[PDB]
Amino acid sequence: MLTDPIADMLTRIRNATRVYKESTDVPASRFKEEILRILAREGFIKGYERVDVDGKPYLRVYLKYGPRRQGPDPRPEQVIHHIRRISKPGRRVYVGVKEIPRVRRGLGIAILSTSKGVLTDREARKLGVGGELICEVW
Amino acid sequence: PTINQLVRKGREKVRKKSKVPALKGAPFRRGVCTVVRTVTPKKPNSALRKVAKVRLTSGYEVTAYIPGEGHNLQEHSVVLIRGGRVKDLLGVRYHIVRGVYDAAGVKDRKKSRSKYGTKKPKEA
RNA sequence: GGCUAAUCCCCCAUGUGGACCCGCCCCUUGGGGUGUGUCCAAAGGGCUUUGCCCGCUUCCGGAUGGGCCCGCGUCCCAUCAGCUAGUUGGUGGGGUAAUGGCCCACCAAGGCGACGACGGGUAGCCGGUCUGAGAGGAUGGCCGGCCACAGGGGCACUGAGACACGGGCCCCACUCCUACGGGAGGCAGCAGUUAGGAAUCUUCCGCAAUGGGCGCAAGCCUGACGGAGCGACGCCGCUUGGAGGAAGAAGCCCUUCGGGGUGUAAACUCCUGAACCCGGGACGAAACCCCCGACGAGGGGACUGACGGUACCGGGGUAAUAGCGCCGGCCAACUCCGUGCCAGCAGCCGCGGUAAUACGGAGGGCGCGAGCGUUACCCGGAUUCACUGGGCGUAAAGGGCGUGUAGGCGGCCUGGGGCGUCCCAUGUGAAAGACCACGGCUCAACCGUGGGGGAGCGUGGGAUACGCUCAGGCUAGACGGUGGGAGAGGGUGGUGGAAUUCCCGGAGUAGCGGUGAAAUGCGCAGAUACCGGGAGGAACGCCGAUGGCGAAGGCAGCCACCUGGUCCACCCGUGACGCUGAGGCGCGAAAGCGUGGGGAGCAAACCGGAUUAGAUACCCGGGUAGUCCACGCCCUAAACGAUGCGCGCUAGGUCUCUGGGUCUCCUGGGGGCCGAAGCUAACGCGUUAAGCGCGCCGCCUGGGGAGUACGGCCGCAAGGC
RNA sequence: UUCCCGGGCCUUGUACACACCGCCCGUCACGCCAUGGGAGCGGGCUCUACCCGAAGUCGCCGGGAGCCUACGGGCAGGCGCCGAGGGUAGGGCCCGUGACUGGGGCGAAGUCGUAACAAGGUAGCUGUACCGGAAGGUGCGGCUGGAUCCUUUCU
Numbered sequence A: 001m002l003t004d005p006i007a008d009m010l011t012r013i014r015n016a017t018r019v020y021k022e023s024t025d026v027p028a029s030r031f032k033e034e035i036l037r038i039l040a041r042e043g044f045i046k047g048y049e050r051v052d053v054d055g056k057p058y059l060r061v062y063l064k065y066g067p068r069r070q071g072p073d074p075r076p077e078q079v080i081h082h083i084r085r086i087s088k089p090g091r092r093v094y095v096g097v098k099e100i101p102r103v104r105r106g107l108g109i110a111i112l113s114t115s116k117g118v119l120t121d122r123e124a125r126k127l128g129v130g131g132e133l134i135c136e137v138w
Numbered sequence B: 001p002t003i004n005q006l007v008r009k010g011r012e013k014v015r016k017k018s019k020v021p022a023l024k025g026a027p028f029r030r031g032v033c034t035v036v037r038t039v040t041p042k043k044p045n046s047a048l049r050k051v052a053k054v055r056l057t058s059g060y061e062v063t064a065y066i067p068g069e070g071h072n073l074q075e076h077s078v079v080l081i082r083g084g085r086v087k088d089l090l091g092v093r094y095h096i097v098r099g100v101y102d103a104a105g106v107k108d109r110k111k112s113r114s115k116y117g118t119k120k121p122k123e124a
Numbered sequence C: 001g002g003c004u005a006a007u008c009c010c011c012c013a014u015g016u017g018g019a020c021c022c023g024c025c026c027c028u029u030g031g032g033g034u035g036u037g038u039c040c041a042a043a044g045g046g047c048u049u050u051g052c053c054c055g056c057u058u059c060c061g062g063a064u065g066g067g068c069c070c071g072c073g074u075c076c077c078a079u080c081a082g083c084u085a086g087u088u089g090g091u092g093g094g095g096u097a098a099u100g101g102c103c104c105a106c107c108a109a110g111g112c113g114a115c116g117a118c119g120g121g122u123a124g125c126c127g128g129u130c131u132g133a134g135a136g137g138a139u140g141g142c143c144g145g146c147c148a149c150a151g152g153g154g155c156a157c158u159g160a161g162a163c164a165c166g167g168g169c170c171c172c173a174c175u176c177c178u179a180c181g182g183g184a185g186g187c188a189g190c191a192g193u194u195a196g197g198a199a200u201c202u203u204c205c206g207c208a209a210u211g212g213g214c215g216c217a218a219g220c221c222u223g224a225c226g227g228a229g230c231g232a233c234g235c236c237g238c239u240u241g242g243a244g245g246a247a248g249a250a251g252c253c254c255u256u257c258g259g260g261g262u263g264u265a266a267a268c269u270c271c272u273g274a275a276c277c278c279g280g281g282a283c284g285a286a287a288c289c290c291c292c293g294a295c296g297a298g299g300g301g302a303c304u305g306a307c308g309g310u311a312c313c314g315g316g317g318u319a320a321u322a323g324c325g326c327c328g329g330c331c332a333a334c335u336c337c338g339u340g341c342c343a344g345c346a347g348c349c350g351c352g353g354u355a356a357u358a359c360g361g362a363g364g365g366c367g368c369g370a371g372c373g374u375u376a377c378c379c380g381g382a383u384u385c386a387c388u389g390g391g392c393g394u395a396a397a398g399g400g401c402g403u404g405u406a407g408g409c410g411g412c413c414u415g416g417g418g419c420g421u422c423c424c425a426u427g428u429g430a431a432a433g434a435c436c437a438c439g440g441c442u443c444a445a446c447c448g449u450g451g452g453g454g455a456g457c458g459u460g461g462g463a464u465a466c467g468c469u470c471a472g473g474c475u476a477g478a479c480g481g482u483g484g485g486a487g488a489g490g491g492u493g494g495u496g497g498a499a500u501u502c503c504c505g506g507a508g509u510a511g512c513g514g515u516g517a518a519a520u521g522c523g524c525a526g527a528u529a530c531c532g533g534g535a536g537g538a539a540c541g542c543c544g545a546u547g548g549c550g551a552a553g554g555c556a557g558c559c560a561c562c563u564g565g566u567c568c569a570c571c572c573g574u575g576a577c578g579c580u581g582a583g584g585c586g587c588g589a590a591a592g593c594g595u596g597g598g599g600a601g602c603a604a605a606c607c608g609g610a611u612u613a614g615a616u617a618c619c620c621g622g623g624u625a626g627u628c629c630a631c632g633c634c635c636u637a638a639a640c641g642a643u644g645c646g647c648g649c650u651a652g653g654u655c656u657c658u659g660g661g662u663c664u665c666c667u668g669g670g671g672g673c674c675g676a677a678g679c680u681a682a683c684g685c686g687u688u689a690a691g692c693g694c695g696c697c698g699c700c701u702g703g704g705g706a707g708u709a710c711g712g713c714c715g716c717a718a719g720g721c
Numbered sequence D: 001u002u003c004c005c006g007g008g009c010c011u012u013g014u015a016c017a018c019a020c021c022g023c024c025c026g027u028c029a030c031g032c033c034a035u036g037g038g039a040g041c042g043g044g045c046u047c048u049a050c051c052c053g054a055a056g057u058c059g060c061c062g063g064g065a066g067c068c069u070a071c072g073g074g075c076a077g078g079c080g081c082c083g084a085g086g087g088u089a090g091g092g093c094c095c096g097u098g099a100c101u102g103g104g105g106c107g108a109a110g111u112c113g114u115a116a117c118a119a120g121g122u123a124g125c126u127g128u129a130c131c132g133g134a135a136g137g138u139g140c141g142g143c144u145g146g147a148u149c150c151u152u153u154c155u
């Protein structure tokens, strides 16, 4: 099957961006949609789209990079420098409000899934909820 | 390993053996020379090394090394064992503490004297 | 044997009340209420003596202290895998303050265990302590809490309470008394002795304080306790001096013989004034008691200090102990003699075999200082058990392969619930400790007061994104229908030619074979070389491949049956049916085993011929098991891609096997080579990953000892795990 | 230009690097040393069956078998269950001891060969089997972690 939907999302993005692709289809979910909404508003993807490929629902994820590097290796600086899953099917991670990490000196974020819904560490913290810690981004 | 492996079996704390049974956990143990003599060292080194097989309050009969420049020990001297070993000859897990029980201290030693157990000398 | 008193023991009454059987009321496990019968009380003593005090009695509460019971937590070994007869439950009963097989009688046949039962080993738990960035690890001396013990084992009695450390009984061991009959003990209370050990204190003062027993009070008892003593055992404070003082003394070390060093260090000069002497001298102690009031509230009065003539205060006063480890690199600190693989050092690299910063002494230096070294033990480093935070192609490490059991994991949409999860309130989280703040000892250590934090569990309330679960629905995963494939995939019957050997026959003449050379061997009983026939066994040239199938092992002539897997088309059906898999079970090259067959070539062992110093070998001649079949065992391997399975994502190019295709080419599924990104220690890998990710299983943790010993299991054995 | 000697350049294999006069494996003997394996012997704990069984609580008798008595009953005392513990016979643990005894170290590389590493001079390795003074040979499979396309040891 696909054992983590989400991981595989994050990954698609990762190998996508590493190879500098202008964007990518990922197979569609209300949740995976939340996550990219957050991921987007928060600066990391150009934005995304709800597409249909071969009669099946996909989300296109458009993809942003920084400008052209000089010298040898002109490959431009990544925006999504790193993205990684935290909670994993059969090993879960749930955090108090006092336990919500904070990321790369605040230069990145966490994504939490709460009963206030999906939100960033900062958002949770001001909201005052905890939840499953989905992912590290920075 | 997976997680479900760590829950299933899970990691193994591993313990360490002792480099010595002075037993007791004792810091030192009293003994009696059974025999005393001189041995040849190991690998690159030549020497005549000074040592005494000693019988113990801990019940075992061991080989200990008599440190420093002269010594006084013979058939049944009685002596104290501290342990710490000698790499260059083998079977010696322990040193004799000089200056205790029937073992003298090394006399004339000016230089490092707590080890070797010699009293501080006076002058004018 | 005999008198005798009481707050000792009885009997009768009173019954506020309580107890018990039966009935009903409310309530919900044996909680209350009530009626009927029954059963149950008591003790005096003192005075300021007719009313007060200390007591007794029955009931109902409080308070404090406990019993008992449940959830959860709570070390190593699976080389401990099964355990259980009061065992597990039931009815009745014994018993107890109370539940309960706690025990007992009779019924039932259960209880427990890989979520580790039973067995073995070890150990008192905890608040806390040590270490660590943390997570963890390690620990449970002192102080508080809880448990257990009181020479070893049983037992009960009295009692509110014990199955009682200075109470009782019996057995045992030991010691002591003994008229040998029989008796007496129990320091794991404080001191102290002895033994053991590397090692652990005074047979001290006091009952002033605090605390406990009894007492109306006075008081009495208190090795609890307050104090003192001894040990650098620790921690903290303090001292062995402060300012001057040479271009820089002697001695001593080094020397390129000019000078360098110890070193402002000394000497000396001038202040101060540890020790010590004199004087004065605590707080810790104010109640119990007594007086007025009312034995209350309140007020007044009296006594009492082990520590101690100590703390502290004032006066006087002397220049007044320094040591230990290090100086090759880790590591701060160098030179001269001595020594010559010796004597010695050594934590590890390693030093010493005549120029040793590494041994030993010297001068000098570095580090700490009433201490400094050492050995021992814990945590650290050690991300070297890796939750944070490792790995497995060659470094240690992927099981030989497969099937699935337990178990772990789980696509897309909607609704219910709200277990996980998140939040809020609240209760608990004793004190001590840690943290912060002020404060008390001249500081500090040590001590007080306050504040803060807290995981965790109980309770109430709330949220529903993710996990679960229940209900519905969908089709991208999985499977199924239809259609089209290819293939040494497997089992059984079958047949076909080539060659080897042997038998038969023909012709046919002296050698063939073999090697580096040769001998052995076979040949005139006519071999080799040739033709014809026959028998028999095994294996399948060419096609054939840098091909194909299969899970691995492995599988090649041809035909027939039996039968597994698999790929592509069509988008037809089901509707998440999915992945993985401990254990289990089944396969499993060769050699090997058992019983029966078979036996042409080949061939361990063997038997000979060579070679060689020898030749238990490589070369030659021969040959047995075995190789082949059948049934049954065996279960290993460089069982190799030395690379577990599944799923998804990430340039290409070229070669190839097999499908479909509007057929330069496109589109699936295999096999190969080069290579983008990226990974790797490198070599290499690279859409057939060793890249980026998720699930699940196996496995590793220096080399040797050793795949040995031991135990268990398997096997006929060899031997396997 | 094949060979002998020395040499240059490219390449290849190495387990050599005081570098092929390098490296290395196995067997023996007598000392001597710790270790480990181990019958029998002595000790300890435990479990099962059987028998003897103190103290004590509980049961039951408590009798023209004793003492008190309101004759209701009590007490002495007696018998039984259980029971610390012992005894006899068996399993299992653990300790001490121990004849006999496998591998390791040094005595001294001492010996006999030359097994492996270079095509190690017959490629090596492997499971298994038989042989053999010893490394070993050899047979059958299998792997490549295999050079390049007479025999002749040891420093």
Ligand SMILES: [Mg+2]
Residues within 6 Å of the ligand: A096
């Ligand atoms: Mg929480």
Ligand SMILES: [Mg+2]
Residues within 6 Å of the ligand: B001
């Ligand atoms: Mg890990």
Ligand SMILES: [Mg+2]
Residues within 6 Å of the ligand: B044, B045, B046, C341
């Ligand atoms: Mg040397």
Ligand SMILES: [Mg+2]
Residues within 6 Å of the ligand: B076, B077, B102
């Ligand atoms: Mg003597």
Ligand SMILES: [Mg+2]
Residues within 6 Å of the ligand: B084, C347
């Ligand atoms: Mg040491």
Ligand SMILES: [Mg+2]
Residues within 6 Å of the ligand: B099, B100
């Ligand atoms: Mg001394």
Ligand SMILES: [Mg+2]
Residues within 6 Å of the ligand: B112
């Ligand atoms: Mg030294």
Ligand SMILES: [Mg+2]
Residues within 6 Å of the ligand: none
């Ligand atoms: Mg009388």
Ligand SMILES: [Mg+2]
Residues within 6 Å of the ligand: none
């Ligand atoms: Mg009444």
Ligand SMILES: [Mg+2]
Residues within 6 Å of the ligand: none
């Ligand atoms: Mg009544």
Ligand SMILES: [Mg+2]
Residues within 6 Å of the ligand: none
């Ligand atoms: Mg009455």
Ligand SMILES: [Mg+2]
Residues within 6 Å of the ligand: none
């Ligand atoms: Mg009374």
Ligand SMILES: [Mg+2]
Residues within 6 Å of the ligand: C062
């Ligand atoms: Mg009250």
Ligand SMILES: [Mg+2]
Residues within 6 Å of the ligand: none
């Ligand atoms: Mg109460």
Ligand SMILES: [Mg+2]
Residues within 6 Å of the ligand: none
């Ligand atoms: Mg209570």
Ligand SMILES: [Mg+2]
Residues within 6 Å of the ligand: none
């Ligand atoms: Mg209670």
